[PDB]
């Protein structure tokens, strides 16, 4: 798709997907799931 | 003299206190690293399951550490001993998948072709024993040219490229967790 | 110092006789010898100039007998003998912390306990510089009120735990939550034990402030404001909840009902703090 | 009776657990896996994995991306980076993520990198909304 066509590997796509994944948990699991960088 | 013996005894007592404090810090870090390794070990076994099933056999070196064959270092210790990439300010924090993703991205986007590779890392044998070993790593061209890859369905160039990018990232993560626990 | 060595030798016995008059008359007396090392020096000079056989550090063979017959006169008399008492607080000045010197060894072996003041703690600003791990009292909790003994047993246990875990955790960060809790509790208790000069503060305020220290009430405030908490919170219970203090004084201990009352008072004061 | 290994850097869900069927959302289309399915490999997409345990219970797990490896011995190793249970999801945060993603798509302009980031975040936002509603 456009991911590999825009000179972007899959690993950066997973990083973008997970960075937009850990925010979908409001009450308590947001801080537990985040392990910084 | 009595004063010289007292000064030497106080110095050795201070040294023992420092080493015991570092032992307690290392014990806490080892307990945390073993707690994470209990989760991260089946993940690495699942990542190695594909290469175990395909039986890919037969360069590149990824040297895991802390602070003709192309060698890429992760940590300041290898640079102190010896350099395509050197990771600095590492080892003060436990490893995560973001670090393995950055390392695998830097390896694959380096523009250097490789057929076979190994990840020189210290695997965790026991509490007092750790063994320096390696994990085989194959590129896209080394996988597409394999004999068993014709038995694996729905494989185009994009799928295999994406698969080896993530499989390299997962293997680097598993080696980082075992190396951190061993260290 | 300008007085003769016989006067320095005689002054502790003169003061002991003055105290023993109160002891034998049914009254209670406290005597301070500041300090007994100067008396031992004066007796050493008199014994050397009297051609007596010296011993270790040129002290005579009865300096122990001198200090023991001085300090055995502090006693708690029986009720049939009047019921009076004499309490002795001898002072020993040591050189570079040499506890193993001859005169400090004798005085330590005579008395019922010692209070160690540390030069290192004094130069850190920790005043009073009492070394808790070196200070011993053989009478112990028998010499305490019910409320003070109740809180000080837990305070001594928590300070012993803090002393155990703070040697290897001077600046460690990757530690267990229990170790960080013990470090925080010990920091609160150590800042609580600090006290100014010429300000005694009665048994009730002392019991109240270290009860607040041991129940985790001060874990939510900065250590540098802990003395300011002492400046204010006691005044609050002197002007808002005098009935709680009256019930504590009536019962003599801290009941769980008074524990709940004091917890509510602390929470109310920390809300406005 | 399929050896379904489902792991992640954060958690391990199943380790050689016997599973009847797994519904994987992949980059080659959402396909289902049964015992002796096929020896394919796959690349995950933001979507929902449906797991059919041997007692008949059905469980769901949102996966951002990973690798799916169905081998010849009917062994499946789905390894996401951040796999969560679908019950641990926020619908309102999903809608906010999707709205911010569309805002980034609109405000990207001629920035192709931020355009790709906005497209990826749009896909994740759509998948999160559909999983939370589903």
Contact at CB, D41 and B159, closer than 8 angstroms: yes
Contact at CB, D5 and B40, closer than 8 angstroms: no
Residue D101: list chain A partners with CB under 8 A.
20
Per-residue tokens: D19: 């599973």
Contact at CB, B24 and C170, closer than 8 angstroms: no
CA dihedral B157, B158, B160, B165 (to 10 degrees): 130
CA distance linking residue B4 with residue C254, whole number of Å: 54
Residue D88 Cα, gap to closest chain A Cα (Å): 7
Contact at CB, C169 and B21, closer than 8 angstroms: yes
Catalytic annotation present for C138: yes
| CA distances for C102 relative to C98, C109, D13, D123, angstroms | 10, 11, 71, 84
State the distance between the two ends of chain B, measured CA to CA, in whole angstroms. Answer: 42
Rg (CA), chain A: 13
Three-class SS state of D71: coil
CA distance linking residue B78 with residue B64, whole number of Å: 9
Per-residue tokens: B165: 């990018």
Contact partners of A by the rule of 3+ C-beta pairs under 8 A?
B, D
| CA distances for B91 relative to B9, B176, D94, angstroms | 33, 11, 35
| CA distances for C74 relative to C17, C63, C106, C142, D104, angstroms | 11, 18, 17, 17, 86
CA distance linking residue D72 with residue B53, whole number of Å: 8
Interior angle at CA A20, CA D109 and CA B94, nearest 5: 125
CA distance linking residue B18 with residue B21, whole number of Å: 5
CA distance linking residue B16 with residue B14, whole number of Å: 5
Resolution in A: 2.7
Closest to D59 measured CA to CA, from D25, D21, D105, D12 = D21
Taking the CB of residue C241, how many other CB atoms lie within 10 A of it? 17
- Check: CB of residue A13 under 8 Å from CB of residue A1: no
Please give the DSSP secondary-structure letter assigned to residue C198.
T
Q: Which residue of A has its CA nearest to B168?
A: A11
Three-class SS state of D114: helix
Q: Please give the backbone phi and psi of residue C130, each rounded to the nearest 5 degrees, phi first.
A: -80, 125
| CA distances for B81 relative to B65, B88, C64, C185, C232, angstroms | 11, 14, 66, 44, 61
Contact partners of D by the rule of 3+ C-beta pairs under 8 A?
A, B
- Check: CB of residue C236 under 8 Å from CB of residue C269: yes
Q: Assess B166–A contact: CB distance below 8 Å, yes or no.
A: yes
Sequence-distant (6+) residues with CB within 8 A of D59 are: D50, D51, D53, D85
Q: Of residues C52, C69, C127, C138, which has the active-site annotation?
A: C138
Interior angle at CA D26, CA D70 and CA B102, nearest 5: 90
Per-residue tokens: B169: 């990232």
Closest to C90 measured CA to CA, from C101, C103, C102, C81 = C103
Per-residue tokens: B116: 């076979």
B80: burial class by Cβ within 10 Å (0-12, 13-18, 19+)?
Answer: exposed
DSSP symbols for C133-181: TT-EESSGGGGS-HHHHHHHHHHHHHHHHHHHHSSS-SS--S--HHHHH
CA distance linking residue C273 with residue C225, whole number of Å: 10
Closest to B162 measured CA to CA, from D124, D44, D4 = D44
Closest to D58 measured CA to CA, from D35, D81, D30, D87 = D87
Q: Beta D12-24 vs D31-33: how paired, if at all?
A: antiparallel
- Check: CB of residue C253 under 8 Å from CB of residue C150: yes
Residue among D5, D7, D8 with most chain B CBs within 10 A, to mutate: D7
Closest to B118 measured CA to CA, from B98, B99, B139, B101 = B139
The residue written with tokens 């996966």 in the block is D63
The residue written with tokens 């869900």 in the block is D13
Residue C128 preceded by cis peptide, ω within 30 = yes
CA distance linking residue B72 with residue C200, whole number of Å: 68
- Check: CB of residue D24 under 8 Å from CB of residue D31: yes
Interior angle at CA D131, CA D126 and CA D134, nearest 5: 120
Q: If residue D2 lies in a helix (H) or strand (E), which one and from where to where?
A: strand D2-7
CA distance linking residue C81 with residue C87, whole number of Å: 17
The residue written with tokens 């008949």 in the block is D56
CA distance linking residue C144 with residue D25, whole number of Å: 73
Residue B2 Cα, gap to closest chain D Cα (Å): 58
Residue B138's beta-bridge partner residues?
B116
Rg (CA), chain C: 23
Interior angle at CA B134, CA B132 and CA B138, nearest 5: 170
Closest to B146 measured CA to CA, from B163, B171, B129 = B163
Closest to D101 measured CA to CA, from D68, D76, D71, D123 = D123
CA distance linking residue C205 with residue A10, whole number of Å: 67
Per-residue tokens: B15: 């040294």
User: Least CB-CB distance to A11: which of B94, B96, B165?
Assistant: B165
Per-residue tokens: C272: 């406005």
Q: Assess B36–A contact: CB distance below 8 Å, yes or no.
A: no
Q: Beta B70-74 vs B60-64: how paired, if at all?
A: parallel
H helical segments located in chain C: 5-24, 36-49, 63-71, 102-110, 119-123, 146-165, 177-193, 203-214, 226-237, 242-251, 256-271
Residue C165: list chain B partners with CB under 8 A.
none
Contact at CB, A10 and B101, closer than 8 angstroms: no
DSSP symbols for chain B: -HHHHHHHHHHHHHHHHHHHHHHHHHHHHHHHHHHHHHHHHHHHHHHHHHHHHHT----EEEEE-----EEEEESHHHHHH-------S-SSS---HHHHHHHHHHHHTT----SEEEEEEEEE-SSS-EEEE--EEE-HHHHHTSSGGGGSSS--HHHHHHHHHHHHHHHHHHHHHHHHHH-
User: Least CB-CB distance to C174: which of B17, B20, B29?
Assistant: B29
Q: Assess C98–B contact: CB distance below 8 Å, yes or no.
A: no
Per-residue tokens: B52: 């175990």
Interior angle at CA B148, CA B147 and CA B149, nearest 5: 95
Q: What share of chain A is helix, strand, coil (3-state, %, to 5)?
A: 50, 0, 50
Q: Assess D84–A contact: CB distance below 8 Å, yes or no.
A: yes
Taking the CB of residue C5, how many other CB atoms lie within 10 A of it? 16
Q: Please give the backbone phi and psi of residue B150, each rounded to the nearest 5 degrees, phi first.
A: -75, -20
Interior angle at CA B78, CA B75 and CA B80, nearest 5: 105
Closest to B182 measured CA to CA, from B174, C67, D95 = B174
- Check: CB of residue C5 under 8 Å from CB of residue C45: yes
Interior angle at CA C250, CA C249 and CA C252, nearest 5: 60
Residue B156: list chain A partners with CB under 8 A.
none
- Check: CB of residue A19 under 8 Å from CB of residue D79: no
- Check: CB of residue C20 under 8 Å from CB of residue C86: yes
CA dihedral C166, C148, C193, C223 (to 10 degrees): 80
| CA distances for C232 relative to C121, C147, C205, C225, D63, angstroms | 27, 22, 12, 10, 56
The residue written with tokens 């009860």 in the block is C211
CA distance linking residue D46 with residue D32, whole number of Å: 16
Q: Beta D2-7 vs D75-80: how paired, if at all?
A: parallel
CA dihedral C114, C128, C16, C139 (to 10 degrees): -40
């Amino acid at each position: 798709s456009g991911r590999r066509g825009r000179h972007v590997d899959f690993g950066a796509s997973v990083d973008f997907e997970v960075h937009m994944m850990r925010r979908a948990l409001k009450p308590e699991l947001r801080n537990e799931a985040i392990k910084r960088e | 003299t009595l004063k010289a013996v007292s000064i030497r005894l106080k110095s050795v007592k201070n040294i023992q206190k420092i080493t015991q404090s570092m032992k307690m810090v290392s014990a806490a870090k080892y307990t945390k690293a073993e707690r994470e390794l209990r989760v991260a070990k089946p993940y690495g076994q699942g990542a190695m399951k594909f290469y175990e099933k395909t039986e890919l056999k037969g360069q590149l070196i990824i040297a895991i550490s802390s602070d003709d064959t192309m060698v890429i270092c992760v940590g300041d210790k290898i640079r102190n001993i010896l350099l395509a990439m050197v990771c600095n300010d590492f080892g003060r924090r436990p490893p995560v998948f973001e670090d393995a993703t950055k390392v695998a991205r830097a390896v694959l986007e380096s523009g250097m072709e490789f057929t076979n590779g190994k990840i020189v890392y210290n695997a965790f044998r026991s509490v007092v024993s750790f063994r320096t070993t390696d994990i085989p790593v194959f590129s896209k061209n080394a996988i597409e040219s394999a004999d068993s890859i014709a038995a694996y369905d729905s494989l185009d160039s994009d799928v295999i490229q994406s698969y080896v990018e993530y499989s390299l990232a997962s293997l680097i993560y598993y080696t980082m967790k075992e190396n951190a626990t061993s260290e | 110092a300008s007085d003769a060595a016989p006067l320095q030798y005689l002054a502790p016995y003169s003061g002991c006789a003055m105290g023993e008059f109160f002891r034998d008359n049914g009254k209670h007396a406290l005597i301070i010898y500041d300090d007994l090392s100067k008396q031992a020096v004066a007796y050493r000079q008199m014994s050397l100039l009297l051609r007596r056989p010296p011993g270790r550090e040129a002290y005579p063979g009865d300096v122990f007998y001198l200090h023991s017959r001085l300090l055995e006169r502090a006693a708690k008399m029986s009720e049939s003998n009047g019921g009076g008492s004499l309490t002795a607080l001898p002072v020993i000045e040591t050189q570079a912390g040499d506890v193993s010197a001859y005169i400090p060894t004798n005085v330590i072996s005579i008395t019922d306990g010692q209070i160690f003041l540390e030069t290192e703690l004094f130069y850190k600003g920790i005043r009073p510089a009492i070394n808790v791990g070196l200070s011993v009292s053989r009478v112990g909790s028998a010499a305490q009120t019910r409320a003070m003994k109740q809180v000080a047993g837990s305070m001594k246990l928590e300070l012993a735990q803090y002393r155990e875990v703070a040697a290897f955790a001077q600046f460690g960060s990757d530690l267990d939550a229990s170790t960080q809790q013990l470090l925080s509790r010990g920091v609160r208790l150590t800042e609580l034990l600090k006290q100014g000069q010429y300000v005694p503060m009665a048994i009730e305020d002392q019991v109240a402030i270290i009860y607040c220290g041991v129940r985790g009430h001060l874990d939510k405030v900065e250590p540098s404001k802990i003395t300011k908490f002492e400046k204010e919170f006691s005044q609050h219970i002197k002007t808002s909840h005098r009935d709680i203090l009256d019930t504590i004084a009536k019962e003599g201990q801290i009941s769980p009902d008074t524990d709940a009352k004091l917890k509510k008072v602390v929470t109310d004061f920390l809300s406005t703090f | 009776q399929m050896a379904f290994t489902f792991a992640a850097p954060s958690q391990v869900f199943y380790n050689n657990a016997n599973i009847r069927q797994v519904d994987v959302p992949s980059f080659s289309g959402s396909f289902g896996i049964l015992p002796a399915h096929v020896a394919t490999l796959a690349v995950l997409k933001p979507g929902v994995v449906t797991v059919y345990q041997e007692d008949g219970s059905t469980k769901k797990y949102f996966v951002s991306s990973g690798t799916v490896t169905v081998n010849d011995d009917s062994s499946v190793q789905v390894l996401a980076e951040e796999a969560v249970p679908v019950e641990n999801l926020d619908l309102q945060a999903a809608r906010d993520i999707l709205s911010k993603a569309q805002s980034d798509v609109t405000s990207a302009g001629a920035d192709m990198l931020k355009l790709a980031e906005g497209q990826i975040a749009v896909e994740v936002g759509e998948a999160l909304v559909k999983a939370a509603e589903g």
